[PDB]
Ligand binder design. Structure first.
Ligand SMILES: O=C(O)c1c(CN2C(=O)Cc3cc(Cl)ccc32)ccc2c1OCO2
Ligand SMILES: O=C(O)c1c(CN2C(=O)Cc3cc(Cl)ccc32)ccc2c1OCO2
Lengths: 149, 149
């Protein structure tokens, strides 16, 4: 549980936003790239695994699941790369609802930034700190600290 | 002290590596940029504060301390921006020692990547996972979890 993350790719302003969700907490990290490629996804995963103890990643599609560059980065970082098939059907809708909510947050900040990448990182900040009771940033730290102890 | 970070800028291959250290744990996040401007520093800080509960940052020099763009991002993200003056003189040397160790790690992986940015993220991964006994990634999570609770 503590080490499982889900990759998700969504589109806005002709660009791609790559998102990693920590499944147990809903904490996210995201980046803007011009298009999804194996190389961009592999670099994103290397960044993520240097920051949090990433044991398993459910990939967002079969191209990233197949990608030799993505498999190389998973090997390097000690990540088990898995498929992202919603064997649990509530999962299509949950990723749908996350993208919808992100895009909403991005729309609420979009005027405070010239470049979409800034607005996405403002949205990551707002999402991770939202209490709506703990925030996602609090939950992930509690989860992993409980795991270590 | 769970929320205090130190910014550090170091040079390699004609490029600049921007580093944030979480002072109590030694955990780091880093990025490669072509040069250290207010805009780049401000974006780096927005990224960092969306990911960890960053309360105070000791800026790495007076240009970033003065920068209106950096002060805008610290305002937006709820960060107290401070100077990075080593009132406690063991601080020049500790920052020095960190850069030298990062650069050593980078040299140990530099052949496994074409682009410096990949090697720096490999170095972040190896630094944060190194056991020293807990790693820096473990220390930071235990510190912040103890603080939440
Ligand atoms: O509101 C949401 O649906 C949401 C979520 C929901 N979320 C969780 O809490 C757990 C989880 C697992 C997965 Cl696999 C996907 C989304 C989520 C996460 C991140 C977000 C969200 O909105 C923006 O960022
Ligand atoms: O070994 C080091 O000197 C080192 C450190 C040392 N470090 C700590 O453990 C606490 C700390 C506070 C500060 Cl303000 C700077 C460096 C460190 C941190 C990050 C690193 C390091 O090497 C690479 O990344």
């Amino acid at each position: 549980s503590p080490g499982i993350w889900q990759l998700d790719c969504t589109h806005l302003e002709g660009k791609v936003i790559l998102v990693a969700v920590h499944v147990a907490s809903g904490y996210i990290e995201a980046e803007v790239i011009p298009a999804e490629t194996g190389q961009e996804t592999a670099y994103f995963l290397l960044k993520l695994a240097g920051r949090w103890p990433v044991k398993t990643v459910h990939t967002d599609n079969g191209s990233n699941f197949t990608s030799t560059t993505v498999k190389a980065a998973c090997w390097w970082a000690g990540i088990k790369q898995e498929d992202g098939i919603p064997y649990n059907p509530q999962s299509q809708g949950v990723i749908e609802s996350m993208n919808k909510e992100l895009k909403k947050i991005i729309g609420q900040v979009r005027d405070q930034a010239e470049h979409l990448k800034t607005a996405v990182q403002m949205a990551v900040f707002i999402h991770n700190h939202k209490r709506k009771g703990y925030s996602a940033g609090e939950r992930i730290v509690d989860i992993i600290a409980t795991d270590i102890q």
